[PDB]
Amino acid sequence: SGPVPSRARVYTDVNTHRPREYWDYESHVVEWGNQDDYQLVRKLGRGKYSEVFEAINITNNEKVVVKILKPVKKKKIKREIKILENLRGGPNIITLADIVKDRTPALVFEHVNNTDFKQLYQTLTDYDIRFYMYEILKALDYCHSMGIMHRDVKPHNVMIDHEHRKLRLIDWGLAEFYHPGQEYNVRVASRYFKGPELLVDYQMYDYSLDMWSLGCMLASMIFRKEPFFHGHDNYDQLVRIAKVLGTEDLYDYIDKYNIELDPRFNDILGRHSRKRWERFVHSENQHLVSPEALDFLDKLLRYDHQSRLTAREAMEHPYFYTVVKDQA
Ligand SMILES: CC(=O)Nc1cc(Nc2cc(NC3CC3)n3ncc(C#N)c3n2)ccc1[C@H]1C[C@@H]1CN
Numbered sequence: 001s002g003p004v005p006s007r008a009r010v011y012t013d014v015n016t017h018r019p020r021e022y023w024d025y026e027s028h029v030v031e032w033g034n035q036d037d038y039q040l041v042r043k044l045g046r047g048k049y050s051e052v053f054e055a056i057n058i059t060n061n062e063k064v065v066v067k068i069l070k071p072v073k074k075k076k077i078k079r080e081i082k083i084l085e086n087l088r089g090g091p092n093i094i095t096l097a098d099i100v101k102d103r104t105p106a107l108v109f110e111h112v113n114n115t116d117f118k119q120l121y122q123t124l125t126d127y128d129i130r131f132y133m134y135e136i137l138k139a140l141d142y143c144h145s146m147g148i149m150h151r152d153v154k155p156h157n158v159m160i161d162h163e164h165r166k167l168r169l170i171d172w173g174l175a176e177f178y179h180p181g182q183e184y185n186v187r188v189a190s191r192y193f194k195g196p197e198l199l200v201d202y203q204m205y206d207y208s209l210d211m212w213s214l215g216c217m218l219a220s221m222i223f224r225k226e227p228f229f230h231g232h233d234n235y236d237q238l239v240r241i242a243k244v245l246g247t248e249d250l251y252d253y254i255d256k257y258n259i260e261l262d263p264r265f266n267d268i269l270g271r272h273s274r275k276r277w278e279r280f281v282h283s284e285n286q287h288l289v290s291p292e293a294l295d296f297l298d299k300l301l302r303y304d305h306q307s308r309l310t311a312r313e314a315m316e317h318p319y320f321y322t323v324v325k326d327q328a
Contacts, residue, residue: 094159201259
């Protein structure tokens, strides 16, 4: 028989309650600005789907970030644009400032004075991790409440201007609208941030996917172990998770949802006990690890997506008490 269906624990019907124009991105008509308003200054990077530059808006002397797309499905282009426009003004979500035609579109973004990822992560105190985790959660609770899952939460998609304690969750190119009963593509996210639902080919996933990704980020930060789950491929990625979370809870999860496991998996998963978080603790990371951090980490990293904390529940955790107190 087939797998057991699933529904998001929260914000289940937020898109059902909205007019179809809000989420029917295939019918979206792109609003184009003037390409002559922007002059590229320098290259920032490149990927499979884009080339990114720093640019100057010559009408107001504003520094921007220009993402020139490579050949991508028109509906996937419309998807990223629509999600960005729906999330405009949301806390800690990057602003899409404009859209111009380069052949291909170029999305124009708000510029964040990003602190060098490796220079930043080796200076972060216990308070900073808690502070920035809290800021990512504001962005996640917001996009989830607006019926959207990011599906690509990882450190490189988080811009931090540390001097101004400013955080922006970027790159909404893999983001989707959540619809109860919809089966989504599992070939999403970066290997090391892939949820067990993706790895076992469970398609009826939801916002809880971003919470697993967040757990991966938190683990790498507090233990100073990047990446935390270091798989050699998608099959071995699950083996690395099972070596920490144990195979017992993994098979209970497979059983609960009636998941047909790939014959390849049978021989490589083996049998593993659930490890204690204390084995990743050493003299170089102990200042970042506390009983509160571990309790919060355990509640994020669950095989069963329905038993992971929501972004709102995560914000009420004791790990954030001093951050919440200081913000008032
Ligand atoms: C725009 C986006 O989604 N792609 C992407 C982003 C950056 N780099 C930067 C750098 C900064 N600021 C630092 C001072 C220069 N900022 N500030 C705001 C944004 C945005 N959005 C931003 N992007 C570099 C490379 C990529 C893409 C090609 C690679 C594929 N993964």
